[PDB]
Protein backbone atom coordinates (compact mmCIF):
# COMPACT_ATOMS: atom_id res chain seq x y z
CA UNK A 156 0.00 0.00 0.00
CA UNK A 157 1.34 3.40 1.14
CA UNK A 158 4.66 4.79 2.32
CA UNK A 159 3.51 5.64 5.87
CA UNK A 160 2.82 1.94 6.38
CA UNK A 161 6.31 1.07 5.11
CA UNK A 162 7.86 3.56 7.53
CA UNK A 163 5.64 2.24 10.34
CA UNK A 164 6.69 -1.36 9.61
CA UNK A 165 10.36 -0.35 9.52
CA UNK A 166 9.99 1.50 12.83
CA UNK A 167 8.61 -1.57 14.57
CA UNK A 168 11.36 -3.90 13.29
CA UNK A 169 13.86 -1.34 14.59
CA UNK A 170 12.23 -0.75 18.05
CA UNK A 171 11.45 2.94 17.31
CA UNK A 172 7.65 2.78 17.56
CA UNK A 173 7.61 5.70 20.01
CA UNK A 174 9.66 7.93 17.69
CA UNK A 175 7.37 7.20 14.76
CA UNK A 176 4.06 8.02 16.46
CA UNK A 177 5.54 11.50 16.83
CA UNK A 178 6.07 11.77 13.07
CA UNK A 179 2.53 10.46 12.45
CA UNK A 180 1.20 13.04 14.90
CA UNK A 181 3.24 15.89 13.38
CA UNK A 182 2.30 14.94 9.82
CA UNK A 183 -1.41 14.68 10.64
CA UNK A 184 -1.64 18.44 11.19
CA UNK A 185 -1.30 18.96 7.41
CA UNK A 186 -4.39 16.84 6.73
CA UNK A 187 -7.76 18.54 6.21
CA UNK A 188 -9.52 19.22 9.54
CA UNK A 189 -13.12 19.85 10.63
CA UNK A 190 -13.44 22.56 13.27
CA UNK A 191 -17.05 22.24 14.52
CA UNK A 192 -19.18 19.17 15.33
CA UNK A 193 -21.65 19.31 12.41
CA UNK A 194 -18.68 19.87 10.00
CA UNK A 195 -17.79 16.16 10.40
CA UNK A 196 -17.82 14.28 7.08
CA UNK A 197 -18.82 10.80 8.34
CA UNK A 198 -22.32 10.03 9.50
CA UNK A 199 -21.43 9.13 13.08
CA UNK A 200 -24.59 7.04 13.55
CA UNK A 201 -23.96 4.20 16.04
CA UNK A 202 -24.37 0.53 15.02
CA UNK A 203 -26.38 -2.05 17.01
CA UNK A 204 -24.39 -5.26 17.53
CA UNK A 205 -26.39 -6.85 20.34
CA UNK A 206 -29.98 -6.45 21.43
CA UNK A 207 -31.36 -6.86 24.90
CA UNK A 208 -34.56 -8.56 25.96
CA UNK A 209 -37.91 -6.99 25.12
CA UNK A 210 -38.07 -5.49 28.65
CA UNK A 211 -37.98 -0.36 30.60
CA UNK A 212 -35.36 2.08 31.84
CA UNK A 213 -32.30 -0.18 31.56
CA UNK A 214 -29.02 1.14 30.24
CA UNK A 215 -27.40 0.60 26.86
CA UNK A 216 -23.71 -0.14 26.41
CA UNK A 217 -21.96 2.20 23.99
CA UNK A 218 -18.65 0.98 22.67
CA UNK A 219 -16.19 3.76 21.82
CA UNK A 220 -14.00 2.65 18.94
CA UNK A 221 -10.28 2.67 19.75
CA UNK A 222 -7.43 4.55 18.14
CA UNK A 223 -5.84 1.58 16.31
CA UNK A 224 -5.45 2.30 12.59
CA UNK A 225 -6.40 -1.31 11.75
CA UNK A 226 -9.57 -0.89 13.78
CA UNK A 227 -13.01 -0.50 12.35
CA UNK A 228 -16.48 -1.86 12.93
CA UNK A 229 -15.28 -5.42 13.71
CA UNK A 230 -13.55 -4.21 16.92
CA UNK A 231 -16.55 -5.06 19.12
CA UNK A 232 -18.00 -8.05 17.24
CA UNK A 233 -16.47 -10.77 19.41
CA UNK A 234 -17.22 -8.92 22.66
CA UNK A 235 -20.76 -7.92 21.68
CA UNK A 236 -22.12 -11.42 20.93
CA UNK A 237 -21.97 -11.97 24.71
CA UNK A 238 -24.35 -9.07 25.29
CA UNK A 239 -26.96 -10.64 23.02
CA UNK A 240 -30.25 -11.05 24.96
CA UNK A 241 -28.59 -8.99 27.74
CA UNK A 242 -28.09 -5.36 26.74
CA UNK A 243 -28.24 -3.17 23.74
CA UNK A 244 -24.65 -2.70 22.57
CA UNK A 245 -24.15 0.16 20.14
CA UNK A 246 -20.73 0.86 18.69
CA UNK A 247 -19.98 4.49 17.83
CA UNK A 248 -17.36 5.18 15.14
CA UNK A 249 -14.45 7.48 15.72
CA UNK A 250 -14.20 10.64 13.57
CA UNK A 251 -11.23 10.60 11.21
CA UNK A 252 -11.27 7.03 9.77
CA UNK A 253 -14.20 6.62 7.33
CA UNK A 254 -14.83 5.80 3.57
CA UNK A 255 -12.10 8.93 -0.46
CA UNK A 256 -10.96 9.74 3.11
CA UNK A 257 -12.29 11.77 6.09
CA UNK A 258 -11.64 15.10 7.78
CA UNK A 259 -9.56 14.92 10.95
CA UNK A 260 -10.92 16.50 14.14
CA UNK A 261 -9.21 19.84 14.63
CA UNK A 262 -8.92 19.01 18.36
CA UNK A 263 -10.16 16.24 20.66
CA UNK A 264 -13.23 17.97 22.05
CA UNK A 265 -14.60 18.61 18.55
CA UNK A 266 -14.57 14.87 17.92
CA UNK A 267 -16.01 13.98 21.31
CA UNK A 268 -18.77 16.55 20.69
CA UNK A 269 -19.64 15.08 17.29
CA UNK A 270 -19.70 11.67 18.96
CA UNK A 271 -21.91 12.75 21.87
CA UNK A 272 -24.39 14.34 19.46
CA UNK A 273 -24.80 10.97 17.71
CA UNK A 274 -25.02 8.92 20.90
CA UNK A 275 -27.76 11.13 22.35
CA UNK A 276 -29.83 10.76 19.15
CA UNK A 277 -29.57 6.95 19.03
CA UNK A 278 -29.79 6.42 22.80
CA UNK A 279 -33.14 8.14 23.10
CA UNK A 280 -33.64 8.35 26.85
CA UNK A 281 -31.94 5.14 27.94
CA UNK A 282 -29.21 5.66 30.52
CA UNK A 283 -25.90 5.13 28.77
CA UNK A 284 -22.80 3.23 29.90
CA UNK A 285 -19.56 3.83 27.97
CA UNK A 286 -16.98 1.20 27.04
CA UNK A 287 -13.48 1.38 25.63
CA UNK A 288 -10.44 -0.87 25.31
CA UNK A 289 -6.86 0.45 25.45
CA UNK A 290 -6.79 3.90 23.77
CA UNK A 291 -10.52 3.58 23.56
CA UNK A 292 -10.63 3.46 27.36
CA UNK A 293 -9.04 6.92 27.64
CA UNK A 294 -11.38 8.07 24.86
CA UNK A 295 -14.49 6.76 26.59
CA UNK A 296 -13.68 8.52 29.83
CA UNK A 297 -13.21 11.78 27.96
CA UNK A 298 -16.54 11.37 26.17
CA UNK A 299 -18.14 10.64 29.52
CA UNK A 300 -16.74 13.88 30.91
CA UNK A 301 -17.76 15.67 27.71
CA UNK A 302 -21.33 14.37 27.99
CA UNK A 303 -21.61 15.39 31.67
CA UNK A 304 -20.37 18.99 31.21
CA UNK A 305 -20.95 20.06 27.59
CA UNK A 306 -24.29 18.23 27.04
CA UNK A 307 -25.68 17.72 30.57
CA UNK A 308 -26.26 14.01 29.97
CA UNK A 309 -23.91 12.25 32.39
CA UNK A 310 -23.48 8.54 31.68
CA UNK A 311 -24.63 5.89 34.11
CA UNK A 312 -21.09 4.47 34.23
CA UNK A 313 -17.90 3.80 32.33
CA UNK A 314 -16.15 0.52 31.56
CA UNK A 315 -12.43 0.98 31.02
CA UNK A 316 -10.78 -2.14 29.52
CA UNK A 317 -7.01 -1.98 30.33
CA UNK A 318 -6.38 1.78 30.33
CA UNK A 319 -2.86 3.20 30.66
CA UNK A 320 -3.45 6.93 31.25
CA UNK A 321 -0.68 9.53 31.10
CA UNK A 322 0.49 9.00 34.67
CA UNK A 323 1.00 5.29 34.34
CA UNK A 324 2.20 4.45 30.84
CA UNK A 325 5.56 2.90 31.73
CA UNK A 326 4.51 -0.71 30.91
CA UNK A 327 3.06 0.43 27.59
CA UNK A 328 6.38 2.07 26.59
CA UNK A 329 8.50 -0.92 27.63
CA UNK A 330 6.26 -3.16 25.51
CA UNK A 331 5.84 -0.82 22.53
CA UNK A 332 7.54 -3.33 20.25
CA UNK A 333 4.73 -5.82 20.88
CA UNK A 334 2.08 -3.09 20.58
CA UNK A 335 3.41 -2.21 17.15
CA UNK A 336 3.73 -5.86 16.15
CA UNK A 337 0.16 -6.41 17.37
CA UNK A 338 -1.15 -3.74 15.01
CA UNK A 339 0.37 -5.57 12.06
CA UNK A 340 -0.67 -9.05 13.22
CA UNK A 341 -4.27 -7.88 13.47
CA UNK A 342 -4.61 -6.60 9.89
CA UNK A 343 -7.54 -7.40 7.64
CA UNK A 344 -6.03 -5.18 4.93
CA UNK A 345 -3.02 -2.88 4.51
CA UNK A 346 -3.42 -0.01 6.99
CA UNK A 347 -4.07 3.12 4.97
CA UNK A 348 -1.84 6.13 5.42
CA UNK A 349 -4.94 8.25 6.04
CA UNK A 350 -5.77 6.17 9.13
CA UNK A 351 -2.19 5.99 10.40
CA UNK A 352 -2.29 9.80 10.46
CA UNK A 353 -5.66 9.70 12.22
CA UNK A 354 -4.13 7.29 14.75
CA UNK A 355 -1.13 9.56 15.33
CA UNK A 356 -3.36 12.61 15.84
CA UNK A 357 -5.57 10.98 18.46
CA UNK A 358 -2.40 9.58 20.08
CA UNK A 359 -1.32 13.19 20.53
CA UNK A 360 -4.74 14.37 21.85
CA UNK A 361 -4.73 11.62 24.46
CA UNK A 362 -1.08 11.90 25.45
CA UNK A 363 -1.73 15.50 26.43
CA UNK A 364 -2.75 17.02 29.75
CA UNK A 365 -6.43 16.40 30.42
CA UNK A 366 -8.18 17.96 33.40
CA UNK A 367 -11.57 16.67 34.48
CA UNK A 368 -12.49 13.38 36.10
CA UNK A 369 -16.00 12.24 35.14
CA UNK A 370 -18.51 11.74 37.94
CA UNK A 371 -19.79 8.44 36.50
CA UNK A 372 -18.78 5.25 38.36
CA UNK A 373 -15.82 3.52 36.74
CA UNK A 374 -15.38 -0.21 36.19
CA UNK A 375 -11.75 -1.07 35.56
CA UNK A 376 -11.18 -4.35 33.68
CA UNK A 377 -7.50 -5.36 33.92
CA UNK A 378 -5.59 -8.06 32.10
CA UNK A 379 -3.88 -10.86 34.06
CA UNK A 380 -0.88 -11.74 31.77
CA UNK A 381 1.82 -9.20 30.85
CA UNK A 382 2.23 -8.36 27.19
CA UNK A 383 6.01 -8.77 27.31
CA UNK A 384 8.77 -9.14 29.85
CA UNK A 385 8.78 -7.31 33.16
CA UNK A 386 10.99 -7.74 36.21
CA UNK A 387 8.87 -8.01 39.34
CA UNK A 388 11.56 -5.73 40.81
CA UNK A 389 9.98 -2.86 38.89
CA UNK A 390 6.45 -2.89 40.25
CA UNK A 391 2.92 -3.27 38.98
CA UNK A 392 2.55 -3.50 35.22
CA UNK A 393 -1.22 -3.74 35.38
CA UNK A 394 -3.45 -1.09 33.90
CA UNK A 395 -4.47 1.67 36.29
CA UNK A 396 -7.33 3.98 37.10
CA UNK A 397 -7.77 6.36 40.02
CA UNK A 398 -10.55 5.21 42.38
CA UNK A 399 -12.13 2.45 40.34
CA UNK A 400 -15.71 1.96 41.50
CA UNK A 401 -14.98 -1.74 40.76
CA UNK A 402 -11.97 -3.78 39.65
CA UNK A 403 -12.23 -6.97 37.60
CA UNK A 404 -9.42 -9.22 36.40
CA UNK A 405 -9.95 -11.28 33.25
CA UNK A 406 -7.66 -13.89 31.69
CA UNK A 407 -4.97 -13.12 29.13
CA UNK A 408 -3.00 -9.99 28.21
CA UNK A 409 -3.58 -6.55 26.66
CA UNK A 410 -4.51 -8.18 23.36
CA UNK A 411 -6.02 -11.58 24.12
CA UNK A 412 -8.48 -10.24 26.70
CA UNK A 413 -10.64 -8.95 23.83
CA UNK A 414 -9.94 -11.77 21.38
CA UNK A 415 -9.88 -15.15 23.09
CA UNK A 416 -11.25 -14.12 26.52
CA UNK A 417 -13.87 -11.53 25.62
CA UNK A 418 -16.70 -13.48 27.37
CA UNK A 419 -14.97 -12.92 30.74
CA UNK A 420 -14.95 -9.18 29.99
CA UNK A 421 -18.69 -9.24 29.20
CA UNK A 422 -19.30 -11.27 32.33
CA UNK A 423 -17.61 -8.59 34.43
CA UNK A 424 -19.65 -5.89 32.71
CA UNK A 425 -22.98 -7.67 33.22
CA UNK A 426 -22.32 -8.38 36.93
CA UNK A 427 -21.31 -4.76 37.40
CA UNK A 428 -24.17 -3.17 35.48
CA UNK A 429 -26.70 -4.87 37.72
CA UNK A 430 -24.87 -4.06 40.94
CA UNK A 431 -25.32 -0.37 40.03
CA UNK A 432 -29.02 -0.32 39.03
CA UNK B 433 0.47 10.50 -6.11
CA UNK B 434 0.99 9.40 -2.50
CA UNK B 435 0.24 10.85 0.91
CA UNK B 436 3.50 12.76 1.44
CA UNK B 437 3.00 14.71 -1.80
CA UNK B 438 -0.51 15.64 -0.63
CA UNK B 439 0.61 16.74 2.83
CA UNK B 440 3.48 18.72 1.27
CA UNK B 441 1.15 20.53 -1.16
CA UNK B 442 -1.17 21.45 1.69
CA UNK B 443 1.80 22.79 3.65
CA UNK B 444 2.92 25.15 0.88
CA UNK B 445 -0.49 26.81 0.63
CA UNK B 446 -0.34 27.42 4.41
CA UNK B 447 3.18 28.93 4.37
CA UNK B 448 4.47 25.92 6.30
CA UNK B 449 7.08 24.73 3.76
CA UNK B 450 9.69 24.94 6.50
CA UNK B 451 7.90 22.86 9.14
CA UNK B 452 7.01 20.16 6.64
CA UNK B 453 10.54 19.87 5.30
CA UNK B 454 11.33 18.86 8.90
CA UNK B 455 8.62 16.18 8.94
CA UNK B 456 10.25 14.77 5.79
CA UNK B 457 13.67 14.58 7.45
CA UNK B 458 12.27 12.98 10.62
CA UNK B 459 10.23 10.52 8.56
CA UNK B 460 13.25 9.58 6.40
CA UNK B 461 15.14 8.08 9.38
CA UNK B 462 12.81 5.07 8.94
CA UNK B 463 13.78 4.40 5.36
CA UNK B 464 16.24 1.58 4.67
CA UNK B 465 19.81 2.86 4.57
CA UNK B 466 23.28 2.07 3.26
CA UNK B 467 26.15 2.72 5.62
CA UNK B 468 29.19 2.10 3.42
CA UNK B 469 29.78 3.37 -0.12
CA UNK B 470 29.78 -0.17 -1.57
CA UNK B 471 26.32 -0.95 -0.01
CA UNK B 472 24.86 1.72 -2.42
CA UNK B 473 21.87 0.35 -4.38
CA UNK B 474 22.34 2.46 -7.54
CA UNK B 475 25.18 2.40 -10.00
CA UNK B 476 26.46 5.93 -9.62
CA UNK B 477 28.00 5.84 -13.06
CA UNK B 478 28.10 9.45 -14.35
CA UNK B 479 26.55 10.35 -17.70
CA UNK B 480 28.15 12.16 -20.63
CA UNK B 481 25.97 15.08 -21.73
CA UNK B 482 28.45 17.18 -23.71
CA UNK B 483 31.59 16.21 -25.56
CA UNK B 484 34.61 18.43 -25.72
CA UNK B 485 36.97 19.26 -28.56
CA UNK B 486 39.25 16.53 -29.86
CA UNK B 487 42.16 18.62 -28.54
CA UNK B 488 45.97 16.46 -22.45
CA UNK B 489 45.86 18.49 -19.22
CA UNK B 490 42.30 19.54 -19.95
CA UNK B 491 39.67 19.85 -17.22
CA UNK B 492 36.22 18.23 -17.31
CA UNK B 493 32.96 19.54 -15.90
CA UNK B 494 31.13 17.30 -13.42
CA UNK B 495 27.58 18.34 -12.59
CA UNK B 496 26.26 17.50 -9.14
CA UNK B 497 22.55 16.72 -9.06
CA UNK B 498 20.60 18.96 -6.71
CA UNK B 499 18.26 18.07 -3.91
CA UNK B 500 14.87 18.96 -5.46
CA UNK B 501 12.68 15.85 -5.46
CA UNK B 502 11.08 17.05 -8.77
CA UNK B 503 14.25 16.53 -10.81
CA UNK B 504 16.84 13.96 -11.76
CA UNK B 505 18.52 13.58 -15.15
CA UNK B 506 16.86 16.33 -17.25
CA UNK B 507 18.37 18.79 -14.75
CA UNK B 508 21.46 19.63 -16.81
CA UNK B 509 20.21 19.34 -20.37
CA UNK B 510 19.71 23.05 -21.17
CA UNK B 511 23.01 23.87 -19.53
CA UNK B 512 25.05 21.05 -21.02
CA UNK B 513 24.33 21.77 -24.70
CA UNK B 514 26.28 25.04 -24.41
CA UNK B 515 29.28 22.86 -23.46
CA UNK B 516 29.18 20.85 -26.68
CA UNK B 517 32.56 21.19 -28.45
CA UNK B 518 33.83 23.03 -25.35
CA UNK B 519 34.18 20.74 -22.34
CA UNK B 520 33.28 17.24 -21.33
CA UNK B 521 30.24 17.38 -19.08
CA UNK B 522 29.38 14.49 -16.78
CA UNK B 523 26.32 14.48 -14.55
CA UNK B 524 26.63 12.38 -11.40
CA UNK B 525 23.42 11.25 -9.63
CA UNK B 526 22.68 11.69 -5.98
CA UNK B 527 22.31 8.43 -3.94
CA UNK B 528 18.74 7.90 -2.75
CA UNK B 529 16.63 8.67 -5.86
CA UNK B 530 16.78 5.38 -7.79
CA UNK B 531 14.45 3.07 -9.82
CA UNK B 532 11.58 -0.31 -6.73
CA UNK B 533 12.98 2.35 -4.36
CA UNK B 534 16.61 3.23 -3.49
CA UNK B 535 18.56 3.04 -0.23
CA UNK B 536 19.25 6.30 1.65
CA UNK B 537 22.71 7.41 2.82
CA UNK B 538 23.31 6.75 6.48
CA UNK B 539 24.87 10.22 6.45
CA UNK B 540 26.10 12.84 3.98
CA UNK B 541 29.68 11.59 3.96
CA UNK B 542 28.56 8.10 2.92
CA UNK B 543 26.81 9.66 -0.08
CA UNK B 544 29.75 11.85 -1.11
CA UNK B 545 32.19 8.95 -0.92
CA UNK B 546 29.83 6.92 -3.12
CA UNK B 547 29.87 9.79 -5.61
CA UNK B 548 33.60 10.53 -5.36
CA UNK B 549 34.29 6.89 -6.26
CA UNK B 550 32.23 6.98 -9.44
CA UNK B 551 33.84 10.33 -10.37
CA UNK B 552 37.49 9.35 -9.96
CA UNK B 553 36.68 6.13 -11.87
CA UNK B 554 35.27 8.24 -14.75
CA UNK B 555 37.50 11.32 -14.82
CA UNK B 556 40.47 9.06 -15.34
CA UNK B 557 43.40 11.45 -15.50
CA UNK B 558 41.52 14.61 -16.03
CA UNK B 559 41.21 17.50 -13.57
CA UNK B 560 37.57 17.72 -12.50
CA UNK B 561 35.47 20.82 -12.00
CA UNK B 562 32.38 20.37 -9.85
CA UNK B 563 29.25 22.33 -10.80
CA UNK B 564 26.01 22.61 -8.84
CA UNK B 565 22.94 24.85 -8.58
CA UNK B 566 20.96 25.73 -5.36
CA UNK B 567 21.09 22.71 -3.03
CA UNK B 568 23.54 21.20 -5.49
CA UNK B 569 26.00 24.01 -4.93
CA UNK B 570 26.08 23.11 -1.24
CA UNK B 571 26.56 19.50 -2.43
CA UNK B 572 29.28 20.48 -4.94
CA UNK B 573 31.39 22.14 -2.30
CA UNK B 574 30.87 19.30 0.17
CA UNK B 575 32.07 16.82 -2.46
CA UNK B 576 35.08 18.95 -3.36
CA UNK B 577 36.13 18.90 0.28
CA UNK B 578 35.61 15.16 0.38
CA UNK B 579 37.65 14.48 -2.76
CA UNK B 580 40.43 16.55 -1.14
CA UNK B 581 40.46 15.53 2.54
CA UNK B 582 39.45 11.88 2.17
CA UNK B 583 40.54 10.79 -1.33
CA UNK B 584 43.64 12.96 -1.64
CA UNK B 585 42.50 14.13 -5.10
CA UNK B 586 41.22 17.73 -4.92
CA UNK B 587 39.21 19.02 -7.89
CA UNK B 588 40.53 21.75 -10.15
CA UNK B 589 37.67 24.14 -9.26
CA UNK B 590 34.10 24.59 -8.05
CA UNK B 591 31.24 26.37 -9.83
CA UNK B 592 28.62 27.34 -7.22
CA UNK B 593 25.48 28.51 -9.06
CA UNK B 594 23.52 30.50 -6.45
CA UNK B 595 24.36 28.95 -3.05
CA UNK B 596 22.69 30.09 0.16
CA UNK B 597 24.97 28.40 2.68
CA UNK B 598 23.86 27.98 6.32
CA UNK B 599 24.61 31.37 7.72
CA UNK B 600 23.08 33.39 4.87
CA UNK B 601 19.68 31.87 4.12
CA UNK B 602 17.51 34.75 5.31
CA UNK B 603 16.35 35.22 1.67
CA UNK B 604 15.52 31.48 1.64
CA UNK B 605 13.15 31.94 4.59
CA UNK B 606 11.43 35.12 3.44
CA UNK B 607 10.91 33.39 0.07
CA UNK B 608 9.81 29.98 1.50
CA UNK B 609 6.44 30.32 -0.19
CA UNK B 610 7.77 31.07 -3.67
CA UNK B 611 10.32 28.27 -3.18
CA UNK B 612 7.73 25.64 -2.33
CA UNK B 613 5.45 26.72 -5.17
CA UNK B 614 8.32 26.56 -7.65
CA UNK B 615 9.00 23.04 -6.41
CA UNK B 616 5.53 22.01 -7.55
CA UNK B 617 5.46 24.19 -10.67
CA UNK B 618 8.48 22.23 -11.96
CA UNK B 619 6.83 18.81 -11.75
CA UNK B 620 6.95 16.89 -14.99
CA UNK B 621 4.97 14.18 -13.12
CA UNK B 622 4.00 13.67 -9.44
CA UNK B 623 6.84 13.76 -6.90
CA UNK B 624 7.24 10.28 -5.47
CA UNK B 625 7.19 10.08 -1.71
CA UNK B 626 10.49 8.19 -1.58
CA UNK B 627 12.06 11.13 -3.39
CA UNK B 628 10.33 13.63 -1.10
CA UNK B 629 11.83 11.77 1.83
CA UNK B 630 15.17 11.85 0.01
CA UNK B 631 14.99 15.66 -0.33
CA UNK B 632 14.15 16.18 3.35
CA UNK B 633 16.99 13.92 4.46
CA UNK B 634 19.57 15.78 2.33
CA UNK B 635 18.14 19.14 3.37
CA UNK B 636 18.78 18.16 6.98
CA UNK B 637 22.39 17.13 6.15
CA UNK B 638 23.06 20.45 4.48
CA UNK B 639 21.85 22.53 7.40
CA UNK B 640 24.34 20.72 9.61
CA UNK B 641 27.69 22.04 10.73
CA UNK B 642 30.04 21.22 7.85
CA UNK B 643 33.12 23.21 8.86
CA UNK B 644 35.51 21.73 6.34
CA UNK B 645 36.23 24.28 3.59
CA UNK B 646 37.74 23.40 0.18
CA UNK B 647 40.96 24.69 -1.30
CA UNK B 648 39.86 24.68 -4.97
CA UNK B 649 39.14 28.02 -6.67
CA UNK B 650 35.45 28.90 -6.50
CA UNK B 651 33.40 30.60 -9.21
CA UNK B 652 30.33 32.09 -7.53
CA UNK B 653 27.57 32.60 -10.14
CA UNK B 654 24.77 34.84 -8.85
CA UNK B 655 21.22 35.53 -9.98
CA UNK B 656 20.48 39.12 -10.97
CA UNK B 657 16.82 39.38 -9.87
CA UNK B 658 15.24 38.53 -6.53
CA UNK B 659 12.91 35.56 -6.45
CA UNK B 660 10.30 37.48 -4.43
CA UNK B 661 10.00 40.74 -2.60
CA UNK B 662 12.83 41.82 -0.33
CA UNK B 663 13.20 44.98 1.72
CA UNK B 664 16.62 46.14 0.63
CA UNK B 665 17.45 47.49 4.09
CA UNK B 666 17.47 43.89 5.37
CA UNK B 667 20.87 43.33 3.82
CA UNK B 668 21.69 41.55 0.61
CA UNK B 669 19.29 39.00 -0.88
CA UNK B 670 21.91 37.69 -3.27
CA UNK B 671 23.65 34.31 -3.08
CA UNK B 672 26.79 34.20 -1.00
CA UNK B 673 30.15 32.41 -0.76
CA UNK B 674 33.26 33.31 1.27
CA UNK B 675 36.34 34.48 -0.67
CA UNK B 676 35.47 33.31 -4.20
CA UNK B 677 38.05 33.29 -6.95
CA UNK B 678 35.53 34.91 -9.29
CA UNK B 679 32.02 36.34 -9.06
CA UNK B 680 29.85 36.28 -12.17
CA UNK B 681 26.24 37.58 -12.30
CA UNK B 682 23.65 36.36 -14.80
CA UNK B 683 20.11 37.33 -15.77
CA UNK B 684 17.05 35.87 -14.09
CA UNK B 685 16.09 34.81 -10.61
CA UNK B 686 17.02 31.77 -8.52
CA UNK B 687 14.87 29.55 -10.78
CA UNK B 688 15.10 31.21 -14.17
CA UNK B 689 18.87 31.69 -14.24
CA UNK B 690 18.94 27.93 -14.80
CA UNK B 691 16.07 27.42 -17.26
CA UNK B 692 15.89 30.51 -19.43
CA UNK B 693 19.46 31.79 -19.09
CA UNK B 694 21.54 28.59 -18.96
CA UNK B 695 23.52 30.07 -21.89
CA UNK B 696 24.60 32.95 -19.64
CA UNK B 697 25.69 30.48 -16.93
CA UNK B 698 27.69 28.34 -19.38
CA UNK B 699 29.56 31.34 -20.78
CA UNK B 700 30.53 32.43 -17.25
CA UNK B 701 31.94 28.96 -16.61
CA UNK B 702 33.83 28.77 -19.91
CA UNK B 703 35.55 32.15 -19.47
CA UNK B 704 36.61 31.26 -15.98
CA UNK B 705 37.83 27.72 -16.75
CA UNK B 706 40.17 29.36 -19.25
CA UNK B 707 41.47 32.02 -16.83
CA UNK B 708 42.57 29.29 -14.45
CA UNK B 709 44.49 27.38 -17.15
Ligand SMILES: *C(=O)[C@H](C)C(=O)[C@H](C)[C@@H](O)[C@@H](C)C[C@@H](C)C(=O)CC[C@@H](C)[C@H](O)CC
Pocket residue numbers: 176221222223224288289290291318319324327334335337338354357358361362409410
Ligand atom coordinates in the same frame (compact mmCIF):
# COMPACT_ATOMS: atom_id res chain seq x y z
C1 LIG C 1 -4.09 0.94 23.24
O1 LIG C 1 -4.68 1.08 22.21
C2 LIG C 1 -2.67 1.49 23.50
C3 LIG C 1 -1.79 0.43 24.18
C4 LIG C 1 -2.78 2.76 24.42
O2 LIG C 1 -3.70 2.87 25.18
C5 LIG C 1 -1.74 3.92 24.39
C6 LIG C 1 -1.05 4.16 25.76
C7 LIG C 1 -2.47 5.20 23.91
O3 LIG C 1 -1.58 6.31 23.89
C8 LIG C 1 -2.94 4.97 22.46
C9 LIG C 1 -3.50 6.30 21.92
C10 LIG C 1 -1.74 4.39 21.64
C11 LIG C 1 -1.98 4.25 20.11
C12 LIG C 1 -0.67 4.25 19.31
C13 LIG C 1 -2.72 2.98 19.66
O4 LIG C 1 -3.60 3.13 18.87
C14 LIG C 1 -2.36 1.55 20.15
C15 LIG C 1 -3.12 0.58 19.61
C16 LIG C 1 -2.85 -0.91 20.01
C17 LIG C 1 -1.70 -0.90 21.05
C18 LIG C 1 -4.18 -1.73 20.36
O5 LIG C 1 -4.09 -2.56 21.53
C19 LIG C 1 -4.70 -2.64 19.19
C20 LIG C 1 -6.04 -3.37 19.48
Ligand SMILES: *C(=O)[C@H](C)C(=O)[C@H](C)[C@@H](O)[C@@H](C)C[C@@H](C)C(=O)CC[C@@H](C)[C@H](O)CC
Pocket residue numbers: 453498499500501565566567568596601604611612614615631634635638
Ligand atom coordinates in the same frame (compact mmCIF):
# COMPACT_ATOMS: atom_id res chain seq x y z
C1 LIG D 1 17.88 25.08 -3.56
O1 LIG D 1 17.70 23.96 -3.93
C2 LIG D 1 17.22 25.62 -2.26
C3 LIG D 1 16.57 27.02 -2.49
C4 LIG D 1 18.27 25.62 -1.10
O2 LIG D 1 19.43 25.72 -1.36
C5 LIG D 1 17.90 25.47 0.41
C6 LIG D 1 18.41 26.66 1.24
C7 LIG D 1 18.53 24.17 0.96
O3 LIG D 1 18.19 24.02 2.32
C8 LIG D 1 17.97 22.95 0.21
C9 LIG D 1 18.70 21.67 0.67
C10 LIG D 1 16.44 22.94 0.46
C11 LIG D 1 15.71 21.77 -0.25
C12 LIG D 1 14.23 21.59 0.18
C13 LIG D 1 15.62 21.98 -1.77
O4 LIG D 1 16.29 21.29 -2.49
C14 LIG D 1 14.65 23.02 -2.38
C15 LIG D 1 14.73 22.97 -3.70
C16 LIG D 1 13.87 23.84 -4.66
C17 LIG D 1 13.00 24.88 -3.89
C18 LIG D 1 14.89 24.25 -5.79
O5 LIG D 1 15.11 25.65 -5.92
C19 LIG D 1 14.56 23.66 -7.19
C20 LIG D 1 15.84 23.22 -7.92
